[PDB]
Scaffold this active site. Sequence first.
Site, PDB file in Angstrom:
ATOM      1  N   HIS A 119       0.840  -1.501  -0.313  1.00 28.23           N
ATOM      2  CA  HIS A 119      -0.292  -0.328   0.211  1.00 28.23           C
ATOM      3  C   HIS A 119       1.266   1.087   0.093  1.00 28.23           C
ATOM      4  O   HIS A 119       2.531   1.338   0.596  1.00 28.23           O
ATOM      5  CB  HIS A 119      -0.538  -0.160   1.720  1.00 28.23           C
ATOM      6  CG  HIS A 119      -0.214   0.205   2.908  1.00 28.23           C
ATOM      7  ND1 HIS A 119      -0.221   1.742   3.083  1.00 28.23           N
ATOM      8  CD2 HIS A 119       0.384  -0.298   3.274  1.00 28.23           C
ATOM      9  CE1 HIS A 119       1.012   2.280   3.625  1.00 28.23           C
ATOM     10  NE2 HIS A 119       1.354   0.731   4.061  1.00 28.23           N
ATOM     11  N   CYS A 120       0.230   2.055  -0.252  1.00 37.37           N
ATOM     12  CA  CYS A 120       0.924   3.606  -0.345  1.00 37.37           C
ATOM     13  C   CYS A 120      -0.019   4.511   0.459  1.00 37.37           C
ATOM     14  O   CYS A 120      -1.042   3.742   1.478  1.00 37.37           O
ATOM     15  CB  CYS A 120       1.351   3.868  -1.692  1.00 37.37           C
ATOM     16  SG  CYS A 120       0.364   4.193  -3.132  1.00 37.37           S
ATOM     17  N   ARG A 121       0.082   5.718   0.049  1.00 36.18           N
ATOM     18  CA  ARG A 121      -1.366   6.977   0.447  1.00 36.18           C
ATOM     19  C   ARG A 121      -2.309   6.263  -0.132  1.00 36.18           C
ATOM     20  O   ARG A 121      -3.633   5.632   0.595  1.00 36.18           O
ATOM     21  CB  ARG A 121      -0.582   7.561   0.077  1.00 36.18           C
ATOM     22  CG  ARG A 121      -1.644   9.156   1.240  1.00 36.18           C
ATOM     23  CD  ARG A 121      -1.696   9.055   2.614  1.00 36.18           C
ATOM     24  NE  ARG A 121      -2.435  10.230   2.465  1.00 36.18           N
ATOM     25  CZ  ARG A 121      -2.042  11.214   4.318  1.00 36.18           C
ATOM     26  NH1 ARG A 121      -1.415  11.193   4.739  1.00 36.18           N
ATOM     27  NH2 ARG A 121      -3.509  12.788   3.523  1.00 36.18           N
ATOM     28  N   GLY A 123      -2.644   3.774  -2.949  1.00 36.88           N
ATOM     29  CA  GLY A 123      -2.799   2.663  -3.352  1.00 36.88           C
ATOM     30  C   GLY A 123      -2.876   2.582  -5.530  1.00 36.88           C
ATOM     31  O   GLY A 123      -3.576   2.580  -5.425  1.00 36.88           O
ATOM     32  N   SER A 127       2.537   1.697  -4.830  1.00 34.91           N
ATOM     33  CA  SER A 127       2.662   0.816  -4.643  1.00 34.91           C
ATOM     34  C   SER A 127       2.464  -0.529  -5.713  1.00 34.91           C
ATOM     35  O   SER A 127       3.140  -1.430  -6.101  1.00 34.91           O
ATOM     36  CB  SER A 127       1.589   0.179  -3.325  1.00 34.91           C
ATOM     37  OG  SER A 127       0.661   0.889  -3.716  1.00 34.91           O
TER      38      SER A 127
END
Length: 181
Positions: A119-121, A123, A127
Amino acid sequence: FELSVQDLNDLLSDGSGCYSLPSQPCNEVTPRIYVGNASVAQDIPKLQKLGITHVLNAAEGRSFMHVNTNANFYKDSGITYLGIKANDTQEFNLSAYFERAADFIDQALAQKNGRVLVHCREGYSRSPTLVIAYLMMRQKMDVKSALSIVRQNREIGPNDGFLAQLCQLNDRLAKEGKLKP
């Protein structure tokens, strides 16, 4: 790489020069690999219900573009954590992490009950890039097929820098052998 990046952007876009944003918090983009946003990463009971055993935070940091978690956050949750402090900018060298991230994904999927959230902030950029690189590296897919399969299962939009880095990875992997279309 500009026009090759343009080709990949053409596979992502909605035909108005714009790009769709994710329709859900989290998606299984290929079996047992999930890509999602910060809200799912920060919800340990939700992760546990989904059966997530491994979390890769590709946006580790403290800013509007990061997610301020760490190993301690997941202490005694049964979830194994890796953090990458990547920035979602064209000049961040995320390719320096492709092998590390692919190794982490492989570590999760090597377990038959393993499921990994990358994940990232949002997605959307960091990511998915790492998952695409994993598919290329560890399942021998060319970049267009790998990007296409992830995009079919989640609205994504790696930034142009990341796309160029994926094109460069495709080149490197293609020096080993043929890549599957």
